[PDB]
Amino acid sequence: STGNNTIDNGKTVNKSSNESN
Amino acid sequence: STGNNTIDNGKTVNKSSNESN
Numbered sequence: 001s002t003g004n005n006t007i008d009n010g011k012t013v014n015k016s017s018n019e020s021n
Numbered sequence: 022s023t024g025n026n027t028i029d030n031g032k033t034v035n036k037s038s039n040e041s042n
Contacts, residue, residue: 002024004023004024005024006022006023006024007022008022
């Protein structure tokens with residue numbers, strides 16, 4: 001908000017599969 | 022969003038194989 005009053009909204013979705021043998 | 026209302030969307034796909042012996 002100043003003295004126009006800029007607004008933002010964010011989403012991140014981060015799956016990360018893994019395997020090791 | 023200001024007081025135009027810029028929007029962005031991003032995707033990254035990062036596989037990383039590995040092996041060691």
